[PDB]
Design a protein around this ligand. Structure first.
Ligand SMILES: *[C@@H]1O[C@H](CO)[C@@H](O)[C@H](O)[C@H]1NC(C)=O
Ligand SMILES: *[C@@H]1O[C@H](CO)[C@@H](O)[C@H](O)[C@H]1NC(C)=O
Ligand SMILES: *[C@@H]1O[C@H](CO)[C@@H](O)[C@H](O)[C@H]1NC(C)=O
Ligand SMILES: *[C@@H]1O[C@H](CO)[C@@H](O)[C@H](O)[C@H]1NC(C)=O
Ligand SMILES: *[C@@H]1O[C@H](CO)[C@@H](O)[C@H](O)[C@H]1NC(C)=O
Lengths: 308, 73, 45, 185, 35
């Protein structure tokens, strides 16, 4: 089965003065006249940016050391070629990851994320090699090797079935597992609405920015929108009055944008905490709580990366 | 710019007053886009290291069993 | 004196005499054009 | 409070100057603008507090769950209550919070051997009930997974499923019979 | 923190030891020797 969860959103930062007045001395003097609004606006946006880096580290950085799969690969008949990293390719990624990476198509600044995609893919590769080679033991202490079919026998004993049913049916089970993996690659490729969550977060953020700029163009009640006309092309004093009203309007627009971002940030953080829990309880071990990690009785899970 | 040597271009910007080293070390201060900085006498800007690298010996016969335990808080 | 050094700017903005290891944002810079050119369209009895 | 001191667009900040020290009507106009500003400041403060309150309530619910599931009982869900396998927990109070002390069990000093899935004796396969077969050099033994404690293979601690043909990797070893037949003569 | 007219740190100050007239320019810092 498949399950998709977002963990982070694009980091942005906006300068108050350059948006409100911008290259207008007298106008900035009027801003000092209001008070200290835009200082706290800056502090709010900085807060959520540092939060986004916190989320990604929380989910992926669960394993201190980097594990490597053995060069010769005979896992008793199981085929992990579609999960493990593919070397004969730049930016080594799994074929499932490559498909996921292509499907998602997408005074203001955009800061860069603190971990590049090579780092994230390295975290996913380490976790896969650890769980294939060493079972769940590497979640508690030192990794302890074990042949793979023996590990699968342990997990069958976990869900209440004796272990001889595995050893007597190793051929059939291996074929079942391989066929299921290859079918998932095709199913994910076909339906376009599969990646419907990771896409929504991108659309909402970009559209919010556009509405901010549109609001910049409007006049909010004045003879003209652009400052310079009101300034030079009327007398200074009542030009100052028109300036004052136009400033109040633009400040309101910045208000709503910041508040909307705070709500969305809270929602994403809730999703990131859920993803961290799923990582530790379902990848690093077997789960007993029903329907947490897929329909049926649980056996194991494989982590895969994605844009956000 | 703050009033009053080495210019190194990066993915985020360009620092002033630090030199890069081909060595990779554990991150101390995060700069962005995969670079960190720390105190040697001099500030050094290097690419981050994910962690120590080790691979367990896997073979279809072997298994490992502990023999002693510790209790932690 | 705030404008003397980068370190002095950092102390001013944290409102303290001692700072801990890290990164901080002191201010933001800009670039000034300092020049003008006008080009009105160029081709009576 | 800082916002209280600022003037928001007026001749003066403090009310009494605008009141007595100008004519009543246009003093009323200046008053009107100043009040509009101060009301906005109160607006932002309340809204920020509502967001922070929601965040704290989420943390309080998590702490209640940790209390009941980890102090009042043993936990099985991995890495919820500390690295390792969980044993117990102690609650300690704090000025605006709570502090836990998780006690766990971490294995160490591992030694590696060779194993086999099943033992073929007398044309019948034997599987272990709990634990895994293990062999030093020539001999064979049975031990549980998490601690090294070798035992002599016996027909009582291993059950029998089928014949010797179907399994893969099975090796051949004698399965010791129970003491009662040996005692019988 | 205050923001007024002040003598910048580490500025260049003239030393004289028949005294030339000097312009005012928003205040002056006057110091005499211990003699
Ligand atoms: C795993 O499946 C792929 C599918 O193309 C196949 O090429 C590969 O040979 C399989 N693995 C092994 C070990 O045969
Ligand atoms: C580091 O790598 C660069 C790569 O071109 C090389 O030029 C340089 O000699 C290496 N050593 C140091 C100390 O920079
Ligand atoms: C595993 O055991 C073999 C012999 O039984 C030994 O040569 C090898 O060093 C062991 N590997 C370890 C202890 O990691
Ligand atoms: C293996 O363990 C048995 C257990 O008593 C011991 O007698 C024997 O000396 C050990 N080594 C070999 C090579 O059998
Ligand atoms: C385990 O791998 C070795 C590789 O040398 C192979 O000879 C042996 O047949 C494998 N075990 C089984 C049960 O096939």
């Amino acid at each position: 089965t498949t399950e998709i969860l977002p963990v982070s959103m694009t980091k942005t930062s906006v300068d108050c003065t350059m948006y409100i007045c911008g290259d207008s001395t007298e106008c900035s003097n009027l801003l000092l006249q209001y008070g200290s609004f835009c200082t706290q606006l800056n502090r709010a946006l900085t807060g959520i940016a540092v939060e986004q880096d916190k989320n990604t580290q929380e989910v992926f950085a669960q394993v201190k050391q980097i594990y490597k799969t053995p060069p010769i690969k005979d896992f008793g008949g199981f085929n992990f070629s579609q999960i493990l990293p593919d070397p004969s390719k730049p930016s080594k990624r799994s074929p499932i990851e490559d498909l996921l990476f292509n499907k998602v198509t997408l005074g203001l600044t955009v800061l860069p994320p603190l971990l590049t995609d090579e780092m994230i893919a390295q975290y996913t590769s380490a976790l896969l090699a650890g769980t294939i080679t060493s079972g769940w033991t590497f979640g508690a202490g030192p990794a302890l090797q074990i042949p793979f079919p023996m590990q699968m026998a342990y997990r069958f004993n976990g869900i209440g079935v004796t272990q001889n049913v595995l050893y007597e049916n190793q051929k059939l089970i291996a074929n079942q597992f391989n066929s299921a993996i290859g079918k998932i690659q095709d199913s994910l490729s076909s339906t376009p609405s599969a990646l419907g969550k990771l896409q929504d977060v991108v659309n909402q953020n970009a559209q919010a920015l556009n509405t901010l700029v549109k609001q910049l163009s409007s006049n909010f009640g004045a003879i003209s929108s652009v400052l310079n006309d009101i300034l030079s092309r009327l007398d200074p004093p009542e030009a100052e009055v028109q300036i004052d009203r136009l400033i109040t309007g633009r400040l309101q627009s910045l208000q709503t944008y910041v508040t909307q971002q705070l709500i969305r940030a809270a929602e994403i953080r809730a999703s990131a905490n859920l993803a961290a829990t799923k990582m530790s309880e379902c990848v690093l071990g077997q789960s007993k709580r029903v329907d947490f990690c897929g329909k049926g009785y649980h056996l194991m899970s494989f982590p895969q990366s994605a844009p956000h | 710019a703050d009033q009053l040597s080495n210019v190194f271009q990066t993915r985020a910007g360009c620092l002033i007053g630090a030199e890069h080293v081909n060595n990779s070390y554990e991150c101390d201060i995060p700069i962005g886009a995969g670079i960190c900085a720390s105190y040697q006498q001099s500030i050094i800007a290097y690419t981050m290291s994910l962690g120590a690298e080790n691979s367990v010996a896997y073979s279809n016969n072997s298994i490992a069993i502990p023999t002693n335990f510790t209790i932690s808080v | 004196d705030c404008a003397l050094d980068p370190l002095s700017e950092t102390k001013c903005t944290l409102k303290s005499f001692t700072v801990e290891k890290g990164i901080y944002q002191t201010s933001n810079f800009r670039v000034q054009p300092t020049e003008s050119i006008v080009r009105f369209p160029n081709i009576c009895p | 409070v800082k916002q209280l001191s600022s003037n928001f667009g007026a001749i003066s900040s403090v009310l009494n100057d605008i009141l007595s020290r100008l004519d009543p009507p246009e003093a009323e106009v200046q008053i009107d603008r100043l009040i509009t500003g101060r009301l906005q400041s109160l607006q932002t403060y309340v809204t920020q507090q509502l967001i922070r309150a929601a965040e704290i309530r989420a943390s309080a619910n998590l702490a209640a769950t940790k209390m009941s599931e980890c102090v009042l009982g043993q936990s099985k869900r991995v890495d919820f209550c500390g690295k390792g396998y969980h044993l117990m927990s102690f609650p300690q109070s704090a000025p605006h919070g709570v502090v836990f002390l998780h006690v766990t069990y971490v294995p160490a000093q591992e030694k590696n051997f060779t194993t086999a899935p099943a033992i073929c004796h007398d044309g019948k396969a034997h599987f272990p009930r709990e634990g895994v077969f293990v062999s030093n050099g020539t001999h064979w033994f049975v031990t549980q997974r998490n601690f090294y404690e070798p035992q002599i293979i016996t027909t009582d601690n291993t059950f029998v499923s089928g014949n010797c043909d179907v399994v893969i990797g099975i090796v051949n070893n004698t399965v010791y019979d129970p003491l009662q037949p040996e005692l019988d003569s | 923190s205050t923001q007024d007219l002040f003598l910048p740190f580490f500025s260049n100050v003239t030393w004289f030891h028949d005294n030339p007239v000097l312009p005012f320019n928003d205040g002056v810092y006057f110091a005499s020797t211990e003699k």
